[PDB]
Amino acid sequence: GRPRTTSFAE
Amino acid sequence: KVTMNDFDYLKLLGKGTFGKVILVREKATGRYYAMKILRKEVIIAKDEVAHTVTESRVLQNTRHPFLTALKYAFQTHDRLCFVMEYANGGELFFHLSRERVFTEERARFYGAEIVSALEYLHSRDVVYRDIKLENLMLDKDGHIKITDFGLCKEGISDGATMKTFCGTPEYLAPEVLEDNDYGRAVDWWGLGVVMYEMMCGRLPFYNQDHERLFELILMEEIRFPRTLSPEAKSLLAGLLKKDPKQRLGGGPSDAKEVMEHRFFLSINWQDVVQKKLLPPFKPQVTSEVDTRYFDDEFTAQSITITPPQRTHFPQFDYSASIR
């Protein structure tokens, strides 16, 4: 079970 | 105007750099909602005001069974608040982590409802750009609800392109990892990654070093379990074609290509949108304040407020009843 991901921009 | 004191604040469902999401009760009606509370100070500092306005605008202008519905968009001097219908079923990330892997039948159900949602957004010239397990929630009946439209782009018709390097590292399409622009096919790559996770029980590419991760996304050939069905292998191979021009859904007909793939042979797509497909899992919620399908990491935390004019955010506020 992978770690939580985080969204990003530029 | 709607304010903070119109709601009871019951349990923390999510937390991070931008702000937090809390299960609230509307005092007037006694009904429960999910309230995403974002700090303006952080949004301005990170230069992300355009993304916050786009999210509200997309939420205001969309209505689909498998997209989350906005009840109220309102703001205070330092906070932006999205009041939304409460999906009690929790994230798909929660369920897939618990069960490790789904059957092809269960993945097909979730996949179809996501394809239905993506066809809707694409027909409306919206590219979602952040398909992933954390952004896919389940409602009380076990149907898909896409959340978080912060990285959406509007006005993207047939063949229109985008420049912003954005998304989530693990889900980025190969073309986004190259210079210049990219098309709406990145959403079908994202569908491919989540479908891969549901059926293969892992990301198709992973490394904690983004340098190594992006090289895998660009350079590495995907693998499948031997026992995965031929149609499932073909679907994932089609969705995860590195060239967006040769990718399933990357042609002019868009979602049609994906809907007509042999993996979804058993699916009537008019029944999908009509909520006529039977959910393979029904959330076992006893009450409305029941948060069993959210991490204790968040739900165990005590609710508190932060101690810190024309600090107004124009074109943000909204009511579902007024419009």
Ligand SMILES: NC[C@@H](NC(=O)c1ccc(-c2ccnc3[nH]ccc23)s1)c1ccccc1
């Ligand atoms: N980038 C991650 C983002 N997490 C979210 O978007 C949500 C967490 C829990 C949500 C929820 C739960 C139940 N019903 C729901 N209905 C509509 C949403 C929702 S949405 C986030 C945003 C901002 C700050 C931290 C984390």
